[PDB]
Design a protein around this nucleic acid. Structure first.
Ligand SMILES: [K+]
Length: 108
RNA sequence: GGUCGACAUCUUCGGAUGGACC
RNA sequence: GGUCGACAUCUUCGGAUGGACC
């Protein structure tokens, strides 16, 4: 619904280079960039659908995006286990963000 | 009138902070 | 009370913009 995954991102590529390429789609998203791959969560599922049709290359019928002059394939169908692990990853990060301020109050 | 390539608004990355907004 | 890893403050090198401040 809200997720796509960019793979085969060239080595040494900074996160900003990845984020910039996705910004060209004109939709708001969060980005996690690990191990030459990047997960992308759009704000709503509808804009993800519209993002897919922009990445879709009708010549080879596959989703692609250019990064540093190279062609990177994107996945629209995430394996169930990978997505499940991913939402838990977020939940921890979000709760970690809120735990920070809570503990700061305790320091008083 | 004086000051300003050393002034402001917005803003990418990076760094340092804690609470921020409604 | 609600929303914030998608909230903000400060800051180095930059970008855009025009006036900014006394
Ligand atoms: K993400």
């Amino acid at each position: 619904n809200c997720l796509i995954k960019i793979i085969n991102i060239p080595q040494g590529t900074l996160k900003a280079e990845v984020v910039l390429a996705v910004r060209h789609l004109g939709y708001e998203f969060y980005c996690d960039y690990i191990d030459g791959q990047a997960m992308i969560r759009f704000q709503n599922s509808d804009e993800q659908r519209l993002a897919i049709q922009k990445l879709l290359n009708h010549n080879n019928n596959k989703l692609q995006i250019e990064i540093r002059g190279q062609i990177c394939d994107v996945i629209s169908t995430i394996p169930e286990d990978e997505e499940k692990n991913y939402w838990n990853y977020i939940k921890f990060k979000k709760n970690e963000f809120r735990k920070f301020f809570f503990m700061k109050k305790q320091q008083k």
